[PDB]
Amino acid sequence: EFNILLATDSYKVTHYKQYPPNTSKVYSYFECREKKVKYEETVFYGLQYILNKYLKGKVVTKEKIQEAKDVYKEHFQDDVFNEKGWNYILEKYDGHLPIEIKAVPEGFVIPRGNVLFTVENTDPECYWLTNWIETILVQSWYPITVATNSREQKKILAKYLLETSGNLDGLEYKLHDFGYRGVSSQETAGIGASAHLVNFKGTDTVAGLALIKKYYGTKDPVPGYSVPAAEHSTITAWGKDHEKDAFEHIVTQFSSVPVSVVSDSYDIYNACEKIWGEDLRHLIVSRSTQAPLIIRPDSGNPLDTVLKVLEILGKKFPVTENSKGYKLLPPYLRVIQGDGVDINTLQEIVEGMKQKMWSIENIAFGSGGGLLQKLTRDLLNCSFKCSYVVTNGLGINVFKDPVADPNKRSKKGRLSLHRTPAGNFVTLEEGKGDLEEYGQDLLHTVFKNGKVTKSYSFDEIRKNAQLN
Amino acid sequence: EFNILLATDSYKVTHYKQYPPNTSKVYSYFECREKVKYEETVFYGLQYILNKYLKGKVVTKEKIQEAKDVYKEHFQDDVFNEKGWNYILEKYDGHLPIEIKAVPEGFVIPRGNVLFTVENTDPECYWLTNWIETILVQSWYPITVATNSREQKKILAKYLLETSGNLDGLEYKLHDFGYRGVSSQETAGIGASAHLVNFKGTDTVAGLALIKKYYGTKDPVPGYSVPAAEHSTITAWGKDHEKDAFEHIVTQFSSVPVSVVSDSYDIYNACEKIWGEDLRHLIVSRSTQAPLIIRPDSGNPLDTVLKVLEILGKKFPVTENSKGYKLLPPYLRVIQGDGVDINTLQEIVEGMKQKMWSIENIAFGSGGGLLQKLTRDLLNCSFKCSYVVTNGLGINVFKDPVADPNKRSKKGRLSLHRTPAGNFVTLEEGKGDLEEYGQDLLHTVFKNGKVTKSYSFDEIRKNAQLNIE
Numbered sequence: 055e056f057n058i059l060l061a062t063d064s065y066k067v068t069h070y071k072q073y074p075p076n077t078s079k080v081y082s083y084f085e086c087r088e089k090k091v092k093y094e095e096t097v098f099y100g101l102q103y104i105l106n107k108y109l110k111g112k113v114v115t116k117e118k119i120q121e122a123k124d125v126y127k128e129h130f131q132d133d134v135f136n137e138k139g140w141n142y143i144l145e146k147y148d149g150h151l152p153i154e155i156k157a158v159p160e161g162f163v164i165p166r167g168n169v170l171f172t173v174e175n176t177d178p179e180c181y182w183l184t185n186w187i188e189t190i191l192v193q194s195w196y197p198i199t200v201a202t203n204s205r206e207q208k209k210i211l212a213k214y215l216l217e218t219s220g221n222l223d224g225l226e227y228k229l230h231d232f233g234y235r236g237v238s239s240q241e242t243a244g245i246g247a248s249a250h251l252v253n254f255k256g257t258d259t260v261a262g263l264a265l266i267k268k269y270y271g272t273k274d275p276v277p278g279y280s281v282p283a284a285e286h287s288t289i290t291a292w293g294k295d296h297e298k299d300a301f302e303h304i305v306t307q308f309s310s311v312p313v314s315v316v317s318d319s320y321d322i323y324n325a326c327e328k329i330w331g332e333d334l335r336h337l338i339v340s341r342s343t344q345a346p347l348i349i350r351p352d353s354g355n356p357l358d359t360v361l362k363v364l365e366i367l368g369k370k371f372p373v374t375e376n377s378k379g380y381k382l383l384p385p386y387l388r389v390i391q392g393d394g395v396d397i398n399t400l401q402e403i404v405e406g407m408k409q410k411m412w413s414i415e416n417i418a419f420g421s422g423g424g425l426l427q428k429l430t431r432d433l434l435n436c437s438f439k440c441s442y443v444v445t446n447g448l449g450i451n452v453f454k455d456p457v458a459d460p461n462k463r464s465k466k467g468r469l470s471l472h473r474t475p476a477g478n479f480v481t482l483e484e485g486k487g488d489l490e491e492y493g494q495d496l497l498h499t500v501f502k503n504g505k506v507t508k509s510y511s512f513d514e515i516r517k518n519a520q521l522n
Numbered sequence: 523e524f525n526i527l528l529a530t531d532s533y534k535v536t537h538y539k540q541y542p543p544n545t546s547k548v549y550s551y552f553e554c555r556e557k558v559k560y561e562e563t564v565f566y567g568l569q570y571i572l573n574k575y576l577k578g579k580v581v582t583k584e585k586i587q588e589a590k591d592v593y594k595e596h597f598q599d600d601v602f603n604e605k606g607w608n609y610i611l612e613k614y615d616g617h618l619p620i621e622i623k624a625v626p627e628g629f630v631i632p633r634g635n636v637l638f639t640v641e642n643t644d645p646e647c648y649w650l651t652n653w654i655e656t657i658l659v660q661s662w663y664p665i666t667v668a669t670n671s672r673e674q675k676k677i678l679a680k681y682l683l684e685t686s687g688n689l690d691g692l693e694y695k696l697h698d699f700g701y702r703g704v705s706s707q708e709t710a711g712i713g714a715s716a717h718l719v720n721f722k723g724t725d726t727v728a729g730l731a732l733i734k735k736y737y738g739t740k741d742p743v744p745g746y747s748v749p750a751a752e753h754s755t756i757t758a759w760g761k762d763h764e765k766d767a768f769e770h771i772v773t774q775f776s777s778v779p780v781s782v783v784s785d786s787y788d789i790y791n792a793c794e795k796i797w798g799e800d801l802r803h804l805i806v807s808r809s810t811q812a813p814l815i816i817r818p819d820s821g822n823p824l825d826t827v828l829k830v831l832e833i834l835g836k837k838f839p840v841t842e843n844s845k846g847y848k849l850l851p852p853y854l855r856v857i858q859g860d861g862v863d864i865n866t867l868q869e870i871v872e873g874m875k876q877k878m879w880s881i882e883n884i885a886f887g888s889g890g891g892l893l894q895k896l897t898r899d900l901l902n903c904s905f906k907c908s909y910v911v912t913n914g915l916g917i918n919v920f921k922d923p924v925a926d927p928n929k930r931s932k933k934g935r936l937s938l939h940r941t942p943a944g945n946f947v948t949l950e951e952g953k954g955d956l957e958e959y960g961q962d963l964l965h966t967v968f969k970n971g972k973v974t975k976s977y978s979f980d981e982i983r984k985n986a987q988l989n990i991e
């Protein structure tokens with residue numbers, strides 16, 4: 055079973071002896087710091103998952119306290135574990151956490167440098183607990199960063215899909231998650247795939263569906279979708295001389311639905327020009343608009359291969375010109391680039407496609423490691439800092455202001471998030487939120503004393519993160 | 523509960539209708555493709571994946587029904603192989619009819635070598651080999667953490683030896699500060715365990731639990747830590763009392779090494795004045811066993827380390843060691859934990875060497891740089907089919923993309939061998955059959971739902987030791 059006591063940074067365990075004596079309240083906040091792709095606005099998503107799966111309900115037990123005491127005794131070569139303080143949470147509160155967490159609604163799109171959630175203890179005996187859970191709470195940068203980075207790529211696709219097409223049809227299916235293999239672990243797969251689906255509807259990371267359903271929920275039958283697709287083993291199993299028989303068997307097996315067939319096993323160009331183009335050309339034309347053939351290259355320079363694949367297919371299938379003057383394949387043929395795609399190369403591909411007058415209706419993208427694994431806590435400066443302590447009945451605003459780095463500066467005091475008269479967001483410090491000059495605090499209590507007090511559906515989160 | 527039927531790539535759900543008819547065997551392998559050049563990799567983590575996700579009765583009639591419900595909605599068509607899964611439940615009691623053979627964990631293998639192979643033991647489950655590709659390819663992460671960690675250990679031993687003449691304390695020099703940095707809790711444990719294959723110091727506690735549960739060690743725990751401060755336990759005394767926080771913390775942990783972050787307001791001022799004059803008496807008094815460690819969390823990593831060392835040198839008696847390098851008094855040490863990755867770490871030690879400072883003075887903490895800034899792309903960890911049997915005929919299969927020379931894969935049934943000189947070679951096309959029995963490194967670790975050979979963490983550490991060690 056998961057044990058919360060063994061779920062914190064090792065140095066934190068000794069923290070209780072280090073705060074000022076008679077400290078009754080430790081108050082901390084989480085933000086995505088401004089740094090002086092831009093990544094100016096970040097999507098808040100994923101806190102609920104950590105609340106339900108790791109903090110809600112009874113999370114302290116006699117067993118868990120004894121397991122922890124014995125680990126830290128060897129780990130530290132000394133008895134420094136705060137047994138008495140953990141036991142207190144067990145006896146007085148039936149092992150529920152005396153903590154309050156207020157957060158922006160999940161799905162809200164917030165400019166950098168703003169407070170998105172705050173943590174404090176509700177019992178003065180548990181001043182040490184606020185930051186005890188900072189490590190677990192700080193892990194939300196991953197869901198935040200995936201969904202923010204996912205959504206920035208959605209912006210890019212929209213811009214060019216509108217520039218070359220005149221509409222946004224299918225936008226939500228244009229970036230497909232191919233990252234299940236790439237992620238550090240099964241749990242990360244689920245979280246990461248969940249954050250992508252805040253913005254899109256296509257994934258092959260089946261773990262993401264289970265996570266949404268268990269912790270968020272949706273009125274829809276499933277949060278995400280996919281189609282049959284081939285992989286190198288299925289294609290290469292027939293042997294190199296029978297690449298055409300595999301293609302034929304696979305399009306025949308899935309004729310009523312879209313099918314993605316990777317065509318780079320031996321020679322991408324040969325498959326496109328001769329096998330798809332001439333030998334199996336009759337099969338492609340027959341397919342309905344609803345179930346088209348998606349030719350997938352998986353090798354070479356990502357932009358250059360996309361372009362040359364499109365030129366060959368244009369020289370082999372009836373290509374038309376849409377309203378904006380960009381060339382468009384027939385509806386039974388599409389292309390998916392799923393190799394070497396991240397936010398940067400995605401920009402180069404679409405910009406390349408536009409200047410050679412190919413419309414974005416033709417293409418879709420797959421991203422794996424570039425979508426769910428090549429991201430760091432550093433990207434958005436997600437950080438968790440103490441802004442307010444109460445010691446001996448006196449509240450004082452606490453912050454860090456390193457001389458070397460201006461940016462690592464932390465907000466001071468009790469904080470709140472407000473909507474401005476112009477319609478933007480401002481974070482107020484030093485309890486200024488109490489005055490309510492700009493209206494009510496947008497932070498809502500989502501956790502208190504071991505109970506999840508406000509929850510959002512994945513369907514709300516999707517609507518809050520919609521592009522303007 | 524975790525469900526294997528829901529733990530694969532969506533499109534693999536439809537692969538059982540794509541293989542050639544009458545396919546009775548699908549045989550695949552894993553390797554880190556040939557491209558700090560990352561020439562050799564440490565194999566670690568498969569045992570975790572075998573025990574947690576692949577052993578025992580991993581199929582139930584309830585799990586089949588769950589998977590069938592999701593997939594029908596997910597693809598919006600009926601494509602789930604209910605019958606194939608049902609066959610595994612009835613005839614094997616939901617145990618996987620799969621054999622996996624693997625190089626021993628801890629082994630250091632040059633790139634381009636097969637590390638393990640997967641094959642189905644029952645002709646009806648030809649579709650099962652690559653169904654579990656996604657779950658097994660995720661051993662790219664422990665392999666990559668263990669490998670990158672090791673490479674940093676190489677750097678640190680070379681410069682510790684040059685500036686010191688000994689490797690004392692080497693395995694405590696790179697300290698895991700990555701628990702907050704990782705994507706998920708499961709990752710934090712896997713990664714931190716992988717780093718402990720080379721070092722003994724970690725603060726990602728999840729790492730300790732994973733090793734004990736899956737690998738085990740004779741010692742009570744594999745990783746150690748000390749008490750240390752954070753920005754909240756300094757700044758909560760108020761800016762005007764940073765000296766009082768320092769004094770309180772050092773006093774509390776007098777008998778053990780204690781590390782305090784001193785850059786909350788002004789790092790230079792803190793070292794020169796608060797540590798240097800106001801609290802100097804409390805530092806000199808401290809024992810060699812439990813020295814004061816000063817940590818700077820801001821600014822340029824190389825510059826700040828030097829400026830801290832320069833200042834402390836002027837307030838504390840500095841000696842010169844056997845090799846002619848500057849060495850702080852035994853009760854005072856520094857630890858750099860901000861912005862450290864394999865690249866910067868090399869720069870810092872090299873920078874220290876230029877200014878004639880012994881590596882004995884320093885320790886490093888790494889967070890995201892150690893456990894998060896890593897991709898499957900770094901070592902080209904990849905899982906490919908190399909051999910199938912269709913219509914009772916064995917065929918060697920491979921992918922040879924024209925555009926990329928490197929992506930090409932091995933053909934046939936594989937084996938790993940050591941020549942009498944000691945270099946490694948993987949024999950393709952089943953030519954390992956020609957070689958004498960017992961030569962092959964790959965030992966069966968998983969067959970039909972049971973783990974058949976296991977290694978303990980102590981042995982894994984022994985296997986992964988550096989040549990210099």
Ligand SMILES: O=C(/C=C/c1cccnc1)NCCc1ccc(-c2cc3c(N4CCC[C@H](C(=O)NCc5ccc6sccc6c5)C4)ncnc3s2)cc1
Pocket residue numbers: 223224225227228230232256258280281283284312314315343344345346348350388389390392415416417418420531533
């Ligand atoms: O390849 C793989 C393998 C991945 C993998 C996994 C693991 C490891 N390694 C790799 N998985 C492909 C899955 C996939 C990806 C994208 C799409 C798209 C749908 C769509 C779209 N909707 C949605 C479907 C229904 C309609 C509709 O059917 N429209 C027709 C249409 C139009 C354009 C395009 S472009 C590609 C398909 C397509 C279909 C309207 N509206 C505009 N754009 C697009 S894109 C469909 C399926």
Ligand SMILES: O=C(/C=C/c1cccnc1)NCCc1ccc(-c2cc3c(N4CCC[C@H](C(=O)NCc5ccc6sccc6c5)C4)ncnc3s2)cc1
Pocket residue numbers: 063064065690691692694695697698699700723725747748750751779781782810811812813815817855856857859882883884885887
């Ligand atoms: O501050 C932090 C920040 C944490 C954090 C967490 C999460 C997020 N954010 C931050 N974590 C400090 C933990 C830490 C790190 C490194 C070390 C070292 C020990 C050691 C060593 N030993 C080991 C102990 C016994 C002997 C011995 O003499 N021990 C005393 C000694 C000697 C040299 C040095 S050098 C630096 C320390 C030190 C201590 C020999 N032999 C040579 N090198 C080193 S390094 C000790 C403790």
Ligand SMILES: [Cl-]
Pocket residue numbers: 284285286316
């Ligand atoms: Cl593939």
Ligand SMILES: [Cl-]
Pocket residue numbers: 751752753783
């Ligand atoms: Cl810290």
